[PDB]
Amino acid sequence: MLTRFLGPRYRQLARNWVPTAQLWGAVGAVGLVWATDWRLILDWVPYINGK
Amino acid sequence: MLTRFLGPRYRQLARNWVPTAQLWGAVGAVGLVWATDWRLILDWVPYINGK
Amino acid sequence: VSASSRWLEGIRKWYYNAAGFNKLGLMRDDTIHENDDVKEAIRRLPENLYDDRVFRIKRALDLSMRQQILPKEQWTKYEEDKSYLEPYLKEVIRERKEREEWAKK
Amino acid sequence: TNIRKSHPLMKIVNNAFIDLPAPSNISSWWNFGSLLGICLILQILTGLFLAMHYTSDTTTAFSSVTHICRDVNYGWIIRYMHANGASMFFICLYMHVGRGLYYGSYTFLETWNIGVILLLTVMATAFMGYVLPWGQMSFWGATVITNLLSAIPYIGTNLVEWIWGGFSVDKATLTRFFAFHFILPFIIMAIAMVHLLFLHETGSNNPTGISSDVDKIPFHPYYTIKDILGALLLILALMLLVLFAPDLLGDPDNYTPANPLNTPPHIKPEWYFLFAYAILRSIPNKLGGVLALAFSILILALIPLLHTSKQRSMMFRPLSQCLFWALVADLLTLTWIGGQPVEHPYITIGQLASVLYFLLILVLMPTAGTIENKLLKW
Amino acid sequence: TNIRKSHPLMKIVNNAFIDLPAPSNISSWWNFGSLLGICLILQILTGLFLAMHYTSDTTTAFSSVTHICRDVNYGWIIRYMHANGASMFFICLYMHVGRGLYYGSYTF
Amino acid sequence: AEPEHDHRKRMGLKMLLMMGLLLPLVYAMKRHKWSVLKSRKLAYRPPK
Amino acid sequence: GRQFGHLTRVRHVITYSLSPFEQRAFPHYFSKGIPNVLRRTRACILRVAPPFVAFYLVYTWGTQEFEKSKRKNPA
Amino acid sequence: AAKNVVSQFVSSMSASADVLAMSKIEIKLSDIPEGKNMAFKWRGKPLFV
Amino acid sequence: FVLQGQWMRLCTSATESEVLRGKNLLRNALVSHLDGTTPVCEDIGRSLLTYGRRIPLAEWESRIAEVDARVVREVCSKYFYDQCPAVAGFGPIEQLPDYNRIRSGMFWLRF
Amino acid sequence: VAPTLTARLYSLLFRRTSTFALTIVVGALFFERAFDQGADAIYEHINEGKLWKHIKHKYE
Ligand code: HEM
Ligand code: HEM
């Protein structure tokens, strides 16, 4: 019954938190990547090619 | 400064709890004796001479 | 109206007897699961109903304790079952949904 | 005034099992919480004594265990109380989760989820427990199961070798499990305290599912003694097993020292996992089976969102009572299947019970609820 | 109102290390309580990892320990953090009992 | 395979004999305390 | 929370009770006892039993089909 | 500093006296007659010839 | 809890000093009560119906006088110690202790 | 004799939690023994598979 959250205001609310939720994903991405020294991802980064 | 507990009433109080404190020692005596099967003590008891 | 209504009604009367709360002297609305809407409606009941409702529930809990049941004579007959709480609950839901509509704008 | 009420320590005890308002209502199905508690300390108590002798290296793993039962004084009752206590623990665990579902106790979101965590935890605890004596089944049951994680894409391999401490179920793999099997029951116990903390916010639910505030009774003397009596019964059950049929619930195959090249034909997990084992092999897919096996226990956490009836308990709802016992029976089928070889009838009937388990929970029970409401004009 | 204050779990945390009224006064000698706490989990954490390798039979007792420092990856820092953590634990312990006596904290 | 065989069965005999005495005994203890709730009678006396 | 004195509101209900040292612990234990249990059994058989026999039938059959599938006659 | 310690503790569960890993096994073929599956031990794992 | 605590205490440990207070209280109550014609006439009438005699103050004093601590803890024990109460509750009694617990408070484990 | 039994038992030994305890501990002593006699005597009577073996093999 998630219809309670369906309306104009809720839609404005979602847009307002978008940049924040996006940036929070940027943090989690780099966060995992750096913490596991992601071979796959890190190779693209200049200066972090310690091989 | 245990003088606060020194007087007639306190003396009556001690006498009143004497039979109780005595009986509570009887319980602890037999209690240890039976629980450790006290060789030393139990030998005197008729019927508990399992040797 | 005809055979049709009676059939559904008798299917309903059958489940009712099978549900079996009436054996504990309870009423349909006594068994309602208490949530926010329900708590408020219980709160809005007038003195008499609220009192009766508590005694009914007490009679039942007491029975359900010794796992006995009421004599057949005193079970609560379908028909005779008062939906005392319904109108209150409906209004409590109807109130909430208004806030909820207002919250969308 | 009264010390029991105001001393910072006793307060707890008092408000937890002395003055706590309890329904006059709760029946035998409510005893399992205390029995689970008793099972816990029992596993901790005997388990400890077993650790004062058991040695955790492949060389003496099996040996030490034998040393325990023959040389160590009464090491045998201890050993058997331990083994059987684990089973008793699972019986009560399943009974407890049973009561919760039937009676709608799961409406207590937090209390129940802590319980799911209690479930996985005691489960994870026992999986490791049985690898310890380093029996054929231990090594092999340890091999079958661990490997399951090797289905997780891109990482199953690395992960399985990581929890293995090598390329196989080696020496690293035994000491590891000893250590965790020692620390897990302590964490279980703390998590069980939070179970109780959260439970105490609402008080207990009851057979009728109707609120009982109107008829509450003090936990002592009623439920201290109703709890005492039911523990004695648990002692009967437990002792009946260790003192008469000690191996009844155990595989004879684990009495043969492990052998990495052997591989028994028989190969099954302990009884308390058979239903889940069934569900797993009923799927002809590596990822599927495992995913499905996970979903099999983690679904206890979906239950509250599937509640549909206007009544909490199932006591007054027969369509659901029927569906409930079908669910029990269907798990009994799953147990049975999982204990049988993956051949003839068993395959397809095992695949049927599986779909059913999920249909019964994910669709049949929710629907029966909506119908029972409709039938009451609710 | 505020979740930190009323959630049955956080209440604890909150009333134990967030809102708890504390003297503006307490000095460095008061740090030993938290350090004792840290020493405890540290001994528990490294201690655990040491138990995933150490074997408890005379035959391999010493051996397993050596196995830890040479073969087990970083088993040496773990082993040494453990050993030294025990000493650190005692230093703080003695410091803590020191503060108590000097400051009369024992009236509790 | 099981040197303990005989010993346990002796305890088992004691376990049944004991439980055959404790079980009813605890029941009666629990019966006696619940007495109060089993025979409680209710009456509802609303005004008017 | 919790505690007696703050649970809920109730009025007009009397409760007569009796000292345990004044009554018997097993009044009509079998007299009223057994009738009740039958009644409770009756009340629940149709809801509890059916799934269990359904398992039972599938159990014994499934077993027979297994055993009898592992033999061959002609061919 | 956090990863380092965490990694070092993570690493503590992998390598060891465990790069036995393995060989080049030499098996006499005239010992396995037609139709038989002979299993040997190689890299801690069963090897079928 | 407190009321029961006192009965128990008196049953098991009445001190001597307090018994003199209680005695004094009674002598003062008796004599203070037998003041004015009405109370006295009522005492004559009731006493004859219940004692068959009229008990002279001098005798009640004698009876009071005879009580000392031992008597108190003896006599209180006979009627209070481990006996079943008759309990009557009216009002907002949600917290009136359960009978079992009221009954348990009629004896104590130290004694 | 019958009512006064449970009665006297209460009178002289049950009120005071003291005696009540003094008796159960003392009562546990005699009981533990008398139970182990009868119990073992029972275990023997249903068996006789060991012990009388001794009268045979040794006696020196
Ligand atoms: C570590 C094993 C567990 C222990 C020691 C434990 C302990 C307890 C205790 C002492 C109670 C008191 C009331 C009663 O038993 O009914 C209780 C009730 C409850 N437990 Fe558990 N529990 C455990 C596992 C579970 C599991 C597996 C679940 C479900 C996933 C669960 C969810 C509940 C719920 C919902 C209740 C409320 C029951 C009601 O009031 O009807 N707990 N538990
Ligand atoms: C922290 C307390 C515990 C300790 C110290 C402990 C330690 C041990 C040890 C050393 C063994 C191997 C010796 C043997 O098999 O007899 C073992 C076996 C086992 N224990 Fe525990 N454990 C504890 C808690 C548990 C818990 C919570 C469970 C789960 C109910 C559990 C279930 C098992 C199982 C399944 C086995 C292997 C089966 C067997 O007995 O042969 N124990 N435990």
> CA F5, CA D287: separation in Å to the nearest integer?
46
Beta-ladder partners of D295: none
**Cβ–ligand 1 contact at D97 (below 6 Å):** yes
What is the whole-number distance in angstroms between the Cα of residue E83 and the centre of ligand 2?
A: 28
Q: Could you list the residue range(s) of the whole structural domain that residue J28 is in?
A: 1-60
Question: E52 near D175, Cβ under 8 Å?
Answer: yes
* Rg of chain J in Å (alpha carbons): 20
Q: Which atom of ligand 1 is nearest to the CA of D188?
A: 1
* Whether F17 and J39 lie within 8 Å, measured CB to CB: yes
E66 C-beta neighbours (distance < 10 Å), count: 13
Residue type (1 letter), D66 = T
CB D353 within 8 A of CB D337: yes
Residue C44: is it exposed, middle or buried by C-beta count within 10 angstroms (0-12/13-18/19+)? Answer: middle
Taking contacts as CB-CB distances below 8 angstroms, the residues of chain B near J26 are 30
Assess J12–B contact: CB distance below 8 Å, yes or no: no
**C78 contacts C12 by C-beta, under 8 angstroms:** yes
Return the closest-CA partner of residue E73 out of H19, D169, D158: H19
Distance CA(C6)–CA(D14), nearest Å, equals 57
- Residues in Cβ contact with D365 at an 8 Å cutoff, skipping those fewer than 6 apart: D306, D308, D320, D323, D324, D327
Amino acid symbol at D65: V
> What is the distance between the alpha carbons of residues B48 and D264, in angstroms, rounded to a whole number?
55
Tell how far the Cα of D42 is from the centroid of ligand 2, in angstroms: 10
Distance in angstroms (rounded) separating the CA atoms of residues A38 and D277: 35
Query: A7 to chain C: which residues are within 8 Å by CB?
Result: 103-105
C68 contact residues in G (CB cutoff 8 A): 36
**Domain span at G70:** 1-75
DSSP H47: E
Distance from chain centroid for Cα H34: 28
Residues of G in contact with F24 (CB under 8 A): none
Does D106 contact ligand 1 (Cβ within 6 A)?
yes
Q: How many CA atoms lie within 13 A of H16 on its CB side?
A: 23
Residue with tokens 């390598």: H15
Dist CA D154 CA H13 (whole Å): 20
Q: Which of I94, I95, I99 lies closest to G17 in CB terms? A: I99
CB-CB under 8 Å, G51 with D21: no
For residues D216 and G4, the answer to whether their CB atoms sit within 8 Å is yes
Residue type, G34: I
Q: Which residues pair with G15 in a beta bridge?
A: F42
Output DSSP code: residue C30: H
d(CA F12, CA F21): 14
| Structural domains of chain A, count | 1
Residues D164/D299, Cβ–Cβ less than 8 Å: no
Rounded distance between C-alpha atoms, residue D290 and residue C61, angstroms: 45
Q: How many domains does chain G have?
A: 1
Structural domains in chain D plus CATH codes: 1-378 (1.20.810.10)
Write out the two tokens for C3. Answer: 């055979």
Angstrom distance (rounded) from CA D337 to CA D356: 14
I45-to-I15, I41, I51, I58, I60 alpha-carbon distances in Å: 37, 6, 10, 19, 17
What is the rounded distance in angstroms from the CA atom of residue D86 to the CA atom of residue D43?
7
Rounded to whole angstroms, the Cα distance separating D100 from D97 reads 5
Q: Give the max Cα distance, chain J.
A: 58
Q: Which amino acid is at I6?
A: Q
Mutation to test the I interface, candidates B5, B10, B11, B12, most I Cβ within 10 Å:
B12
Q: CA of J39, closest CA in chain F: separation in Å?
A: 6
Nearest Cα to I32, choosing from I63, I57, I52?
I57
Query: What is the nearest CA distance from J15 to chain B, expressed in angstroms?
Result: 12
- Superfamily for F4-48? Cytochrome c1, transmembrane anchor, C-terminal (1.20.5.100)
Alpha-carbon span F37 to D26, nearest angstrom: 13
Residue E72 CB neighbour total at 10 angstroms? 28
Q: What is d(CA D199, CA D107) in angstroms, rounded to the nearest whole number?
A: 11
Between the CA of residue J40 and those of D236, E41, F14, F23, J26, what are the distances in Å? 20, 52, 9, 21, 22
Rounded to whole angstroms, the Cα distance separating D331 from D346 reads 14
- In eight-state DSSP terms, residue B7 is S
H25: tokens are 């096994």
H41: left (phi > 0), else alpha (psi -120 to 50), else beta?
A: beta
Count of structural domains within chain J = 1
Q: Report the binding-site residues of D for heme b.
A: 82, 96, 181, 195
DSSP class of residue B33 equals H
Q: How far is the CA of D128 from the centre of ligand 2 (A)?
A: 8
Q: How far is G58 from chain I (nearest CA, A)?
A: 52
Single-letter amino acid, residue E42? L
CA of D80, closest atom in ligand 2: 40
Helix axis angle, I57-66 to I16-33, nearest 10°: 170
Q: State how far the Cα of E23 lies from the Cα of D198, in Å rounded to an integer.
A: 32
Q: What angle do CA D327, D331, D334 make, to 5 degrees?
A: 140
- Whole-angstrom distance, CA of residue G10 vs CA of residue D51: 55
Distance of CA E10 to the CA centre of its chain: 22
Q: Do chains C and H touch (3 or more CB pairs under 8 A)?
A: no
- Selection from F26, C54, G7, I90 nearest residue D20 by Cα: G7
CATH number of the domain to which G6 belongs: 1.20.5.210
Q: CA dist E78 to A12, H9, I37, I58, Å? A: 52, 8, 97, 91
CB D223 within 8 Å of CB D231: no
Of G12, G16, G20, which has the smallest distance from its Cβ to F35's Cβ?
Answer: G20
Instruction: Classify I69 as helix, strand or coil.
Output: helix
Instruction: Number of helices (H) and strands (E) in chain A: give both, helices first.
Output: 3, 0
The rounded Å distance from CA F31 to ligand 1 centre is 25
Domain range spanning residue C65?
Answer: 1-105
Joined together, the tokens standing for residue D149 give 């994680």
DSSP state string for J1-60: -HHHHHHHHIIIIISSHHHHHHHHHHHHHHHHHHHHHHHHHHHHHT--SSSTTHHHH---
Helix, coil or strand: residue I33: helix
**What CATH number is attached to the domain comprising A34?**
1.20.5.220
Q: How many Å apart are CA E6 and CA D169, to the nearest integer?
A: 47
Closest CA to C68 of G23, G36, D25: G36
For H37, the 3-state DSSP assignment is coil
Q: How far off is chain I from J27, nearest CA to CA, in Å?
A: 19
Note the Cα I61 to chain centre separation in Å: 16
* H or E segment and range at residue H39: strand H39-42
Residues of H in contact with D167 (CB under 8 A): 18, 21, 43-45
CATH code where residue C49 lies? 1.10.1090.10
Cβ contact D69:D76 at 8 Å: yes
Residue D49 to residues B9, D87, D124: CA-CA distances in angstroms?
Answer: 52, 19, 21
Q: Check CB contact under 8 Å for J22 and B30.
A: yes
Full domain range(s) for residue A19: 1-51
Q: Would you state the structure tokens that stand for residue C44, as one six-digit string?
A: 């809005």
Q: What distance in angstroms lies between residue E85's CA and the mean position of ligand 2's atoms? A: 29
Number of H helices, E strands in chain H: 1, 2
Ligand 1 atom closest to residue D205's alpha carbon, by position in its atom list:
40
CA of D47 to the centre of ligand 2 (A): 5
**Residue among D159, D172, D144 nearest D58 (CA):** D172
Instruction: State the DSSP H helix or E strand holding residue H41, giving kind and residue range, or none if neither.
Output: strand H39-42
How many residue contacts between D and H have a Cβ separation below 8 Å? 32
Nearest to C66 among F38, F42, F44 (CB): F38
* Catalytic center residues of D: 200, 204, 226-227, 270
**Residue D222: Cβ-neighbour burial (10 angstroms; 0-12, 13-18, 19+):** buried
Q: Which residue of chain F has the CA closest to C55? A: F44
Q: In this structure, which ligand is nearest to the CA of D47?
A: 2
Q: Do the Cβ atoms of C7 and C30 come closer than 8 Å?
A: no
Long-range (24+ apart) CB contacts under 8 A made by D183-188 are: D183/E48, D184/D121, D184/D124, D184/D125, D184/D128, D185/D40, D185/D43, D185/D44, D185/D47, D185/D125, D187/D121, D188/D40, D188/D118, D188/D121, D188/D122, D188/D125
Residue D108 near residue D265, CB atoms below 8 Å: no
- Which helix (H) or strand (E) is F44 found in, with range? strand F41-44
* Beta carbons of D168 and H44 less than 8 angstroms apart: yes
Smallest CA-to-CA distance from H12 within D175, G29, G40, G58 is with: D175
| Torsion angle (degrees, nearest 10) of CA D97, D101, D102, D104 | 130
Question: Which residue's entry shows tokens 């490997």?
Answer: D147
Q: How far apart are CA D141 and CA D129, in angstroms?
A: 11
Residues F8/D81, Cβ–Cβ less than 8 Å: no
Name which residue sits closest to atom 34 of ligand 1, judged by CA. D112
In terms of phi and psi (left: phi > 0; alpha: psi -120 to 50; beta: otherwise), the region of D184 is alpha
User: For residues D194 and E9, is the Cβ–Cβ distance under 8 A?
Assistant: yes
d(CA D350, CA H21): 40
Q: For G1-75, list the strands marked E by DSSP.
A: 13-16
- β-strand partners of F41: G16
Burial class from Cβ neighbours inside 10 Å (0-12, 13-18, 19+) for residue C81 reads middle
How many domains are there within chain C? 1
* Residue in G2, G44, G52 nearest the CB of D20: G2
Map residue F12 onto helix, strand or coil: helix
What residue spans of chain C are helical by DSSP H?
A: 3-19, 28-31, 36-44, 47-66, 86-102
Residue of J nearest to F21 (CA): J35
CA I44 to ligand 1 centroid distance, Å: 69
Instruction: Answer for the pair D274, D268: CB distance below 8 angstroms, yes or no.
Output: yes
Stretch (H or E) spanning F41: strand F41-44
Pairing state of beta strands D216-218 and G13-16?
unpaired
Cβ neighbours of residue J19 under 8 Å, at least 6 residues apart? B23, J12, J13
Tokens of B17: 């709890």
Experimental method: X-ray
CA-nearest residue to G20 within chain I is I100
Q: What angle do CA D74, D79, D85 make, to 5 degrees?
A: 125
Mutating to test ligand 2, I would choose from D39, D50, D118 the residue with most ligand atoms within 8 A of its C-beta, which is D50
Alpha-carbon span D173 to D165, nearest angstrom: 6
Q: Closest residue (by CA) to atom 9 of ligand 1?
A: D33
Residue E31: what residue type?
A: N
Give the whole-angstrom CA distance, residue D337 versus residue D353.
9
Interface B–I counts its CB contacts (< 8 A) at: 20
What is the spatial distance between Cα I28 and Cα D57, in angstroms, rounded to a whole number? Answer: 86
Cα–Cα nearest to I21, from I32, I13, I12, I29: I29
Is residue G2 classed as helix, strand or coil in its secondary structure?
coil
Give the residue among D262, D298, D292, D258 at the shortest CA–CA distance from D277.
Answer: D292
Say if G19 is an interface residue toward chain D (CB within 8 Å).
Answer: no
Nearest ligand (C-alpha, residue D72): 2
- Direct distance between the N- and C-terminal alpha carbons of chain E, in angstroms, rounded to an integer: 35
Closest ligand to the CA of D101: 1
Residues that constitute the known binding site of D for a ubiquinone:
200
CB D221 within 8 A of CB F29: no
Beta bridge partners of D288: none
Q: Which ligand is nearest to the CA of D41?
A: 2
3-class SS string, chain D: CCHHHHCCCHHHHHHHHCCCEEECCCCHHHCHHHHHHHHHHHHHHHHHHHHCCCCCCHHHHHHHHHHHHHCCCCHHHHHHHHHHHHHHHHHHHHHHHHHHHHHCHHHCHHHHHHHHHHHHHHHHHHHHHCCCCCEHHHHHHHHHHHHHHHHCCCCHHHHHHHHHCCCCCCCHHHHHHHHHHHHHHHHHHHHHHHHHHHHCCCCCCCCCCCCCHHHEEEHHHHHHHHHHHHHHHHHHHHHHHHHHCCCCCCCHHHHCECCCCCCCCCCCCCHHHHHHHHHHHCCCCHHHHHHHHHHHHHHHHCHHHHCCCCCCCCCCCHHHHHHHHHHHHHHHHHHHHHCCCCCHHHHHHHHHHHHHHHHHHHHHHHHHHHHHHHHHCC
- To test the contact with chain C by mutation, choose from A6, A9, A12 the residue with the greatest count of C C-beta atoms within 10 A, namely A9
The backbone torsions φ and ψ at residue D171, rounded to the nearest 5 degrees and listed phi first, read -75, -45
Beta-carbon contacts of D199 under 8 Å, excluding residues fewer than 6 positions away, are D108, D111
> In this structure, are residues H20 and H44 in contact, taking their beta carbons and an 8 Å threshold?
yes
